[PDB]
Amino acid sequence: CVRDPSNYRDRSADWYAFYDERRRKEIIDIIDEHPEIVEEHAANPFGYRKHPSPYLQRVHNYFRMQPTFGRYYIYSEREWDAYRIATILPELGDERFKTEEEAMHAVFLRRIEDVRAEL
Amino acid sequence: CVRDPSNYRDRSADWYAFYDERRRKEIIDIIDEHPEIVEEHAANPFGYRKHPSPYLQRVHNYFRMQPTFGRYYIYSEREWDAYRIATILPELGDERFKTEEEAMHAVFLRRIEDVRAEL
Amino acid sequence: MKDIAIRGYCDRPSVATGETIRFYVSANETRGTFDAELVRLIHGDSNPAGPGYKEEAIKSDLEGQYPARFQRTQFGSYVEVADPDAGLQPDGAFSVHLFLWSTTPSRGRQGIASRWNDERQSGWNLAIEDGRVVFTIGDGSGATSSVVSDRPLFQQIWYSITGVYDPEKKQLRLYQKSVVNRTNSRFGLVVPLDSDCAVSADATVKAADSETSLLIAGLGEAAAQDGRTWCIAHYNGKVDAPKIYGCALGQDDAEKLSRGEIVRPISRLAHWDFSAGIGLNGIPTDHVVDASGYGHHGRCMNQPSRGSTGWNWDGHEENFIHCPEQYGALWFHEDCLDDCRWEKDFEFTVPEGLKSDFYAVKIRYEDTEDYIPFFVLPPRGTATAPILVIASTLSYLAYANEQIMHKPVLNENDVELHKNLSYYGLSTADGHIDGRGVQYTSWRRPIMNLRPKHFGSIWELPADLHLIDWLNHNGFEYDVATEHDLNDQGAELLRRYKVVLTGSHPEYQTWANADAWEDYLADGGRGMYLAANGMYWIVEVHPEKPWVMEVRKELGVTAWEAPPGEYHYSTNGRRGGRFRGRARATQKIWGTGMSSFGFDHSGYFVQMPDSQDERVAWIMEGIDPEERIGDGGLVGGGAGGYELDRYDLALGTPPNTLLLASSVEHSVVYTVIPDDKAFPHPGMNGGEHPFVRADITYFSTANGGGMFATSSISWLGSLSWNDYDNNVSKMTKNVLNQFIKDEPAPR
Amino acid sequence: MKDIAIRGYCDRPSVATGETIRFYVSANETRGTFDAELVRLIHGDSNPAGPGYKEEAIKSDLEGQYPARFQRTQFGSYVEVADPDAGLQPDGAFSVHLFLWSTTPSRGRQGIASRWNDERQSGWNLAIEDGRVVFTIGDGSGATSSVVSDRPLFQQIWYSITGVYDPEKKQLRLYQKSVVNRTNSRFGLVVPLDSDCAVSADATVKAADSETSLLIAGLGEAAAQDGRTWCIAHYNGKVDAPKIYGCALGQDDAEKLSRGEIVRPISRLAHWDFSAGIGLNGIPTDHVVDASGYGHHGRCMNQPSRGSTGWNWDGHEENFIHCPEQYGALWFHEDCLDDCRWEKDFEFTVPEGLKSDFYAVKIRYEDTEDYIPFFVLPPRGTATAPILVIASTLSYLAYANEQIMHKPVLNENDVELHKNLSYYGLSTADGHIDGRGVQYTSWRRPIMNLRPKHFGSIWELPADLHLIDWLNHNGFEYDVATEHDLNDQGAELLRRYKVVLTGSHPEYQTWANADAWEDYLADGGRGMYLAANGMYWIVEVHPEKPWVMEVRKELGVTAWEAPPGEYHYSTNGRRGGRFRGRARATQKIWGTGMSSFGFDHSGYFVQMPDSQDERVAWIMEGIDPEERIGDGGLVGGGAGGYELDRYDLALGTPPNTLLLASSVEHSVVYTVIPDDKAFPHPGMNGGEHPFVRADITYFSTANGGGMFATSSISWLGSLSWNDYDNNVSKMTKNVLNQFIKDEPAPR
Amino acid sequence: QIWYSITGVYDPEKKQLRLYQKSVVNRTNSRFGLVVPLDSDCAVSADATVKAADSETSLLIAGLGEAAAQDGRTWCIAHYNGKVDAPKIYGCALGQDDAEKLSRGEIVRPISRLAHWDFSAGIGLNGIPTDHVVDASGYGHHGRCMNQPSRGSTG
């Protein structure tokens, strides 16, 4: 019989761990075998009038759907004319960015460092 | 007064003509810059255990949704051991193929001939 | 090409012992004879990498020679009103009023309401020809008399059309008025729509007796021979409550009919109310009530769409059993078929000594060889084996005569579906020429994609012959039921068996079948789900016609979507979309449910950390724990492929369920189903999302029971790989040697 | 970082002349005062590439200093029963029964039903702590007496719970029983569920008077001051028909209650039927009826979900107005807010000479500037301009307090939504802690993403201030109405004006607004649809509380999906999902409707061959035929962006529609919306599928009027680019100078 | 025994009282029917010389208050005799067109209500066995039937 709700867990989390392991290996192999997408994202993070490469688009598809995607915001105030990187009260960073394209490329580099540090 | 149905046509067909124009130009440029996709598709047309290139998948996404996709069926009967390629009664072809991978690659070549032979 | 020259079907899918089946066969032309005998299907797939075709001919009373003949098929929907007395052919003045909603207004000549003869042009009709509404009378001498409208018809716009005949001034008259409101038509009230006319012409002849029935949505071909009238020119679109008066009308009375007011009730001759009979359980009938009290009752032929939106529909009620006065329309497609109405050629009564298995009838013409599959049950109330194999016949009717060339590898059976559409009918995954999906499908027609002979897409019944051949090659003794039988009986059918296997693609189930499965598993039952996409669409069998199925779809893994007011079924009033939207998802019963679909090739399974559990070492016994479960096979090239089911606790997987393996190496072509998307972002694909996977599960139920699910279509295509020496057959053999024992199922 | 120290809200969105708006302000702590002054808003976007922030001060009777004070906000759905005479505290034995469905049974301590004081432990309560059901009484001197269940609760399972107090044996009892069927719970009847107990403890104290109100889904904080009982321990999940008896029940009585039978109907003290008052107009009221005749009528606070699936819901009916005996539950989230109930600080009567425009009350605290937006109408029945601008306030309530960090650039008003959730509430685009999305939203709370200041998307009020700034930079004279005023007044509001402009994102409409737009354009009316996603979701304004909006979404462009039996609105018993599924698509009224969406940047418009037509030579008057339209702007750097509409005759685009331009260069991140997908397959993205486009259209209605549709959001954002000299501004100005003439709009 | 619609409007911005009156007879609800030539409609006005001050009493339907509320009890004196269907107070002055739309049962200006007692809120499948009169404006000004008026009467 079934009587206590703490004896039973979500057994799909084992597969989420497995999927995340193989997924991180694939993404760091994409980053290492193609070192031009980092400069491609530095030149234009929004893809304004130049849509991203398929490998850069695959890296963007990997980052934008994590449960750990919900870190690294770009904080501002109405009286700064600058951009700082919030990190999850949140705890801001230190280096300032005069445009938000520099802030987005900083967040992208910091996410590449985060996916390298977890392997 | 809107009184006669023949006075009015579906005016989105002009945009479909414009769209098919630009899309055919982009696909023939993608083929003429990366000619190895035909070698890859002759290697393994189903993508079995080797998933296709992003450009080859883009070519397949262009081919699998045109109104002209409804041509080119592969036809066979129970006592042939041969694969013939129909063309819309259907117009059966001449060349015989002993697997359907050869027939699919011939269909893919003939669709490249069709997209070149229009503009 | 090879020209298929013989066809056929059965009256009913399953036949027990002692009761009689009938076989209805037609040929291309009446000459010669055809041979016939009984076979027993063992394997169907003639893939050279596999076991190939297998059968076993049975001596019975069935065989012999029978004369071949051509049998004409009525094709298309209509309402037939029988009138032997010519009461609906008036002597003097008469009027005809109906509401009209045309979907193909320019597709040939279309008759709306006629008591007409077209051999000799006699009677009267109210037809659409050259895009205009034309009210013609005739007398049989060839000389007709027409009145033709000025304004043509728009597509899918409700009109009110009155045809008036007046001998006192020797004049025909025709009225026409658009009755659009905010909701019922193609476009709305913002248009400057001028489509109203009131024209007339002189009448030179008299409307004589046509010697036919009265038809709605059609003309009559010739005189009524043996009490049967052949409909020819089929209308396409809704018709809401037609009526005949016995006097000539005026423009003011046509104006008042165009507001739905019944003018002159005592002067009616007939008035068919298409919404008379709608109770709290739909309208499960074919009987069309004469609402004028004269007894001119109708009869729906070839299944038009009951329970459709009428002319006065505003979207305050979207359920027709609670607002029946806004739902009096029938759709009348030109290409429906619920029964071929053929004449019998030969019958067959199942003897006492005949094993329950898949059978067929091998018809042999001159140069053509055809099969008619039917099933044989055990005797009523008994069981001859512990293993029951349900043959998923509702999903056989789902993809019955599924046409791709009309809409990829093709045989000579698909070019016959293209070349003779009027003999074969359509599938529920098809679409009508109106642009609407097919709701009603039928068994009493030749289903050409059901025959066992002939990578990317293997048909339904050979995919069950996979499991049948696997059970025959091993030592397992089995019975066979159908989903129609499980609908008819319930869990009383299932409780006579120790374990119940499920077919290759059990996609369309009735509500009562799901209740029977939950009642069977709930008390000591055992079951295997060796498939995927397994309880997706709600389906109801028609109560009067048990060979006709119904499904009305919505946004899911669908070929089409139902129009806005028309989601509730006509055979019962209940909602019936997909099972997941009714809080009855597949995970609540079987453990897994639909997650992703694709169409190129298959993948293999990788063992999860619950494979090494000591509770379920009895499943993964003769399998090294570093292997790949199911790589290579006859469908796709792997076990987990082409449609996938996943474990999910939020949809209702039992909390004690184990997750034994999972499928990997799926292409980017495997998309995530529309049921799991909130905002579609890119990367909703296989290899880029955590929902594209299969999941092999197990959970125990009460009173010593269990359930084992493998969550893939191509699991059964891997059983006969490497000459029955692989991991798929060893796993299925472990669980099937466990479930038929007499100890309770393990926890 | 920056510490937001001052808040506030209006009691109503729009105010005509001669009537009073009240402003309800609060600060973090009670010290000092605050300034206030009225301004007129002109341009909101403080982007340095645009015009910059623009306001205008008004000498009114409002400015001065007012005392700052902190005001506590009640937060969470519950049901409060006023009991002054302490009738629901029996002097002897009593018993409590209720049905239970819990979403978060392990999130702290959660009170279910109670007449309890928490500062001093007095009264009785039925609660959830440690995942178990605990029934506790207390005397007031700190000493309690509890009885605790044995089996803990499962998540989202219907339980029947009977708390029993019995002084004659000095014994507390508690009977717990699970009442799952096939459809109402998280999992089905296939589980061997053992979640039943019957326990007992020792009542050592006597239950005293808590001097509070009886609460469902909550414990009372302290004693009742000014008749208000503060609620602390909120519950998360459905409660179905609670009842209090005046006698100690037995196990047989608990067994008969668990089947739905009312035992001892004269021994009841109170019985709250939550399904009492469900007619064919829904249940648009907060009055919880005492169904036993004692006058213990409750009152829903902070709007729990009326009309939710009960314990006895088999899915034979899904519309709750036709089966009210199976819809007696209320959801009770812990984080709802429909009114802050704050005490007034100051009010403002609108004087005579005050132009109808957008206004705001600028509150100046110590180092924090705050705004409170509201709208001023023309006087009732008067039209002081030939142009009307519809502020899309229903979509302002949709995206009100749209929390992202709780769910990418952030300002200081987003981290304060995250840090203080109890002061602000949630948005319909968000979801609750239970997993169900937020349905009800409200004006009477501080909406923090509505303040006008601060490359991606912009909040909805500065996106309309773009249009306000463009009208003020030219010489056009306009009025301002809101969608609440359109809802209240109908097409009588619209018939006073020549041309009516629509706001930047009018996504959520009511049905009455759609009827007003159709009746206005049908009879000589003119409009501009300067936006996209135009009429997608159906909103109904609550009839008792006109500040409360309701939406129950479904599949489509959503963020959350409604649970299976709960699609129908409670403010009116109607279906109300998206407009397109009610046969009222956006193309049928405004010519174009939703086709695609995405989030990176914008494109530009390429002209179609109907630009060179001479019927539309008045539109393209100063534009060379080789130019781009909107290539560069404030929103994405283009005019066609972020959400796109298209031309479609099948959905109801009027036939005489011309197609002026169309948008290109959309990335692969722009997906096709799920309404257009039959089978999802790869290539359903922007630049790879034809449906991803914007379409500038124009059709002419009857009696000299028409409609112009730009079909993109960023069209208004690209009006001030290159200092008002671009193709977008000249095209908008050409069409607007044509519409405000006295000649009929051309054909 | 003739159904009227009566609107009383106070306007300080013009220092003016106003009163509207309109008969709403249909075929069935009144003493006589639609065959009469009934002219009983008016729209008059006067001068507001004073200000409406606090009465320190309860609000009554069908009655006046006698003196100030002593021990929380207000003594009703001048009793009306006849039906009263759903009274409501707005917080703003109305016009003749808005009184015309109230006289068709359309609730005008829903956000500007102060109170709106719906005498038919509570009617289930077992009658209305209560004395509690629901404020249908959502402000909490709930009523209390005193000395048993006839519930469930024709509107």
From TrEMBL, chains A, B:
* Keyword Hydrolase attributed: yes
Q: Which GO terms describe its molecular function?
A: N,N-dimethylformamidase activity
Q: Which Pfam families match?
A: DMF_alpha
Top-rank taxon = Bacteria
Domain N,N-dimethylformamidase alpha subunit as annotated: residue spans: 15-116
- Keyword presence, Hydrolase: yes
- Write the Enzyme Commission number(s) for this entry: 3.5.1.56
Which terms are listed as keywords in the entry? Hydrolase
What is the protein name for this chain? Answer: N,N-dimethylformamidase small subunit
This protein's encoding gene:
dmfase1
TrEMBL record, chain E:
Going by the entry's taxonomy, the superkingdom of the source organism is recorded as Bacteria
Question: How is this protein named in the record?
Answer: N,N-dimethylformamidase large subunit
Native source organism of the sequence: Paracoccus sp. SSG05
Q: What lineage is on file?
A: Bacteria, Pseudomonadati, Pseudomonadota, Alphaproteobacteria, Rhodobacterales
Name the gene for this chain: dmfase2
What stretch of the complete protein does the chain hold? 156 to 310 of 762
